[PDB]
Design a protein around this motif. Structure first.
Motif, PDB file in Angstrom:
ATOM      1  N   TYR A 140       2.632   0.313  18.117  1.00  0.00           N
ATOM      2  CA  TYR A 140       1.821   1.060  19.125  1.00  0.00           C
ATOM      3  C   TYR A 140       1.062   1.856  19.662  1.00  0.00           C
ATOM      4  O   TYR A 140       0.396   2.348  20.387  1.00  0.00           O
ATOM      5  N   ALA A 141       0.934   2.485  18.863  1.00  0.00           N
ATOM      6  CA  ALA A 141       0.323   4.349  18.488  1.00  0.00           C
ATOM      7  C   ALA A 141      -0.569   4.533  16.992  1.00  0.00           C
ATOM      8  O   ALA A 141      -0.416   5.114  16.621  1.00  0.00           O
ATOM      9  N   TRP A 142      -1.445   3.141  17.206  1.00  0.00           N
ATOM     10  CA  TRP A 142      -1.453   2.971  15.305  1.00  0.00           C
ATOM     11  C   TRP A 142      -3.229   3.717  15.142  1.00  0.00           C
ATOM     12  O   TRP A 142      -3.701   4.599  16.390  1.00  0.00           O
ATOM     13  N   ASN A 143      -3.089   4.648  14.082  1.00  0.00           N
ATOM     14  CA  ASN A 143      -4.176   5.647  13.589  1.00  0.00           C
ATOM     15  C   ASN A 143      -5.261   5.130  12.582  1.00  0.00           C
ATOM     16  O   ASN A 143      -5.243   4.494  12.385  1.00  0.00           O
ATOM     17  N   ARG A 144      -6.375   5.636  13.439  1.00  0.00           N
ATOM     18  CA  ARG A 144      -7.812   5.003  12.950  1.00  0.00           C
ATOM     19  C   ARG A 144      -8.370   6.170  11.977  1.00  0.00           C
ATOM     20  O   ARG A 144      -8.789   7.544  12.889  1.00  0.00           O
ATOM     21  N   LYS A 145      -8.461   6.241  10.634  1.00  0.00           N
ATOM     22  CA  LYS A 145      -9.282   7.071   9.516  1.00  0.00           C
ATOM     23  C   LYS A 145     -10.123   6.972   9.459  1.00  0.00           C
ATOM     24  O   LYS A 145     -10.770   5.157   8.942  1.00  0.00           O
ATOM     25  N   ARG A 146     -11.423   7.319   9.381  1.00  0.00           N
ATOM     26  CA  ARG A 146     -12.650   6.626   8.611  1.00  0.00           C
ATOM     27  C   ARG A 146     -13.072   7.631   6.871  1.00  0.00           C
ATOM     28  O   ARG A 146     -11.722   7.811   5.906  1.00  0.00           O
ATOM     29  N   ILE A 147     -13.382   5.982   6.351  1.00  0.00           N
ATOM     30  CA  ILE A 147     -14.178   6.302   5.195  1.00  0.00           C
ATOM     31  C   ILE A 147     -15.687   5.663   5.104  1.00  0.00           C
ATOM     32  O   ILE A 147     -15.887   4.918   5.484  1.00  0.00           O
ATOM     33  N   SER A 148     -16.225   7.101   4.566  1.00  0.00           N
ATOM     34  CA  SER A 148     -17.513   6.987   4.756  1.00  0.00           C
ATOM     35  C   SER A 148     -18.137   8.079   3.250  1.00  0.00           C
ATOM     36  O   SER A 148     -17.158   9.036   3.293  1.00  0.00           O
ATOM     37  N   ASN A 149     -19.739   8.272   2.727  1.00  0.00           N
ATOM     38  CA  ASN A 149     -20.171   9.813   1.521  1.00  0.00           C
ATOM     39  C   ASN A 149     -19.681   9.830   1.351  1.00  0.00           C
ATOM     40  O   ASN A 149     -19.232  10.204  -0.087  1.00  0.00           O
ATOM     41  N   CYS A 150     -18.495   8.616  -0.405  1.00  0.00           N
ATOM     42  CA  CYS A 150     -17.566   8.540  -0.781  1.00  0.00           C
ATOM     43  C   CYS A 150     -17.374   6.945  -2.419  1.00  0.00           C
ATOM     44  O   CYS A 150     -17.988   6.071  -1.589  1.00  0.00           O
ATOM     45  N   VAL A 151     -17.122   7.449  -3.174  1.00  0.00           N
ATOM     46  CA  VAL A 151     -17.270   6.322  -4.227  1.00  0.00           C
ATOM     47  C   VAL A 151     -15.638   6.075  -4.276  1.00  0.00           C
ATOM     48  O   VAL A 151     -15.144   7.795  -4.253  1.00  0.00           O
ATOM     49  N   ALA A 152     -15.242   5.005  -4.609  1.00  0.00           N
ATOM     50  CA  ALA A 152     -13.597   5.030  -4.647  1.00  0.00           C
ATOM     51  C   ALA A 152     -13.679   3.848  -6.243  1.00  0.00           C
ATOM     52  O   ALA A 152     -14.548   3.519  -7.109  1.00  0.00           O
ATOM     53  N   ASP A 153     -12.288   3.118  -6.440  1.00  0.00           N
ATOM     54  CA  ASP A 153     -12.260   2.480  -7.459  1.00  0.00           C
ATOM     55  C   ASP A 153     -10.796   1.844  -6.806  1.00  0.00           C
ATOM     56  O   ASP A 153      -9.716   1.845  -7.303  1.00  0.00           O
ATOM     57  N   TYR A 154     -11.163   0.226  -6.240  1.00  0.00           N
ATOM     58  CA  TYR A 154     -10.692  -0.560  -5.695  1.00  0.00           C
ATOM     59  C   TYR A 154      -9.289  -1.319  -7.008  1.00  0.00           C
ATOM     60  O   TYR A 154      -8.474  -2.033  -6.459  1.00  0.00           O
ATOM     61  N   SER A 155      -9.888  -0.448  -8.100  1.00  0.00           N
ATOM     62  CA  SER A 155      -9.003  -1.306  -8.886  1.00  0.00           C
ATOM     63  C   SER A 155      -6.971  -0.774  -8.627  1.00  0.00           C
ATOM     64  O   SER A 155      -6.303  -1.248  -8.570  1.00  0.00           O
ATOM     65  N   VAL A 156      -7.171   0.932  -8.291  1.00  0.00           N
ATOM     66  CA  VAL A 156      -5.972   1.922  -8.455  1.00  0.00           C
ATOM     67  C   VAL A 156      -4.751   0.730  -7.396  1.00  0.00           C
ATOM     68  O   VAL A 156      -3.197   0.746  -7.288  1.00  0.00           O
ATOM     69  N   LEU A 157      -5.410   0.519  -5.897  1.00  0.00           N
ATOM     70  CA  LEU A 157      -4.522   0.184  -4.797  1.00  0.00           C
ATOM     71  C   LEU A 157      -3.504  -1.431  -5.288  1.00  0.00           C
ATOM     72  O   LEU A 157      -2.630  -1.774  -5.264  1.00  0.00           O
ATOM     73  N   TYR A 158      -5.080  -2.431  -5.968  1.00  0.00           N
ATOM     74  CA  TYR A 158      -4.449  -3.827  -6.238  1.00  0.00           C
ATOM     75  C   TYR A 158      -4.126  -3.842  -7.395  1.00  0.00           C
ATOM     76  O   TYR A 158      -2.745  -4.327  -6.569  1.00  0.00           O
ATOM     77  N   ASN A 159      -3.981  -3.094  -8.314  1.00  0.00           N
ATOM     78  CA  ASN A 159      -3.210  -3.244  -9.957  1.00  0.00           C
ATOM     79  C   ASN A 159      -1.400  -2.151  -9.220  1.00  0.00           C
ATOM     80  O   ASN A 159      -0.488  -3.437 -10.108  1.00  0.00           O
ATOM     81  N   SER A 160      -1.409  -1.011  -8.682  1.00  0.00           N
ATOM     82  CA  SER A 160      -0.683  -0.592  -9.248  1.00  0.00           C
ATOM     83  C   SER A 160       1.005  -1.536  -7.909  1.00  0.00           C
ATOM     84  O   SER A 160       0.323  -2.237  -7.283  1.00  0.00           O
ATOM     85  N   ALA A 161       1.360  -2.010  -8.480  1.00  0.00           N
ATOM     86  CA  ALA A 161       3.044  -2.493  -8.079  1.00  0.00           C
ATOM     87  C   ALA A 161       3.697  -2.170  -6.654  1.00  0.00           C
ATOM     88  O   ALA A 161       4.233  -3.279  -6.406  1.00  0.00           O
ATOM     89  N   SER A 162       3.808  -1.250  -6.492  1.00  0.00           N
ATOM     90  CA  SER A 162       3.802  -0.238  -4.620  1.00  0.00           C
ATOM     91  C   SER A 162       3.207  -1.326  -4.214  1.00  0.00           C
ATOM     92  O   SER A 162       4.383  -1.542  -3.509  1.00  0.00           O
ATOM     93  N   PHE A 163       2.209  -1.008  -4.174  1.00  0.00           N
ATOM     94  CA  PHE A 163       1.698  -2.190  -3.050  1.00  0.00           C
ATOM     95  C   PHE A 163       1.460  -3.462  -3.487  1.00  0.00           C
ATOM     96  O   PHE A 163       0.836  -4.680  -3.811  1.00  0.00           O
ATOM     97  N   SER A 164       2.727  -4.541  -2.490  1.00  0.00           N
ATOM     98  CA  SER A 164       3.284  -5.206  -3.260  1.00  0.00           C
ATOM     99  C   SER A 164       2.360  -7.031  -2.264  1.00  0.00           C
ATOM    100  O   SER A 164       2.178  -7.629  -2.357  1.00  0.00           O
ATOM    101  N   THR A 165       2.419  -6.272  -0.865  1.00  0.00           N
ATOM    102  CA  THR A 165       1.984  -7.804   0.151  1.00  0.00           C
ATOM    103  C   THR A 165       0.590  -7.571   0.229  1.00  0.00           C
ATOM    104  O   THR A 165       0.490  -5.940   0.505  1.00  0.00           O
ATOM    105  N   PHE A 166      -0.392  -8.565  -0.550  1.00  0.00           N
ATOM    106  CA  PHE A 166      -0.962  -8.318  -0.906  1.00  0.00           C
ATOM    107  C   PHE A 166      -2.565  -9.504  -0.251  1.00  0.00           C
ATOM    108  O   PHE A 166      -1.967 -10.770  -0.192  1.00  0.00           O
ATOM    109  N   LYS A 167      -3.678  -8.964   0.576  1.00  0.00           N
ATOM    110  CA  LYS A 167      -4.059 -10.686   1.494  1.00  0.00           C
ATOM    111  C   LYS A 167      -5.308  -9.967   1.930  1.00  0.00           C
ATOM    112  O   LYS A 167      -5.576  -8.886   3.207  1.00  0.00           O
ATOM    113  N   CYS A 168      -6.119 -10.993   1.742  1.00  0.00           N
ATOM    114  CA  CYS A 168      -7.599 -10.514   2.398  1.00  0.00           C
ATOM    115  C   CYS A 168      -8.703 -11.596   2.574  1.00  0.00           C
ATOM    116  O   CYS A 168      -8.787 -12.426   2.579  1.00  0.00           O
ATOM    117  N   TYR A 169      -9.415 -10.866   4.005  1.00  0.00           N
ATOM    118  CA  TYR A 169      -9.712 -12.148   4.861  1.00  0.00           C
ATOM    119  C   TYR A 169     -11.092 -11.885   4.362  1.00  0.00           C
ATOM    120  O   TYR A 169     -11.732 -11.207   5.388  1.00  0.00           O
TER     121      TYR A 169
END
Lengths: 50, 50
Positions: B1-30
């Protein structure tokens, strides 16, 4: 003059139809083929081709 | 009910880390393939947390 006018109009609308999504995520094909796996890019490209 | 909204900009990442790590299990992208968010890159990114 009117035959040239008609032919230019037909080619103009034919070309302008390329910028059209047609129920796909994005009009340009390389985009949707670069941001999708083959299994769903197949559906998007299929709608575009149709 | 009180979701927090955070920015990501002017930055470089590597989306491998989130996907491959088994800690984040529930994965689905639209509309975006997972393995491909390494090469796809976006204007601004919005992170909502709850």
């Amino acid at each position: 003059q009117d035959v040239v006018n008609q032919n230019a109009q037909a080619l103009n609308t034919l070309v302008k139809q390329l910028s059209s999504n047609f129920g796909a995520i994005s009009s340009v094909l390389n985009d949707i083929l670069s941001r999708l796996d083959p299994p769903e890019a197949e559906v998007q490209i299929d709608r575009l081709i149709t | 009910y009180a979701w927090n909204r955070k920015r990501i900009s002017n930055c470089v990442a590597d989306y491998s880390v989130l996907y491959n790590s088994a800690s984040f299990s529930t994965f689905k992208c639209y509309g975006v393939s997972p393995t491909k968010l390494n090469d796809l890159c976006f204007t601004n990114v919005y992170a909502d947390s709850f």
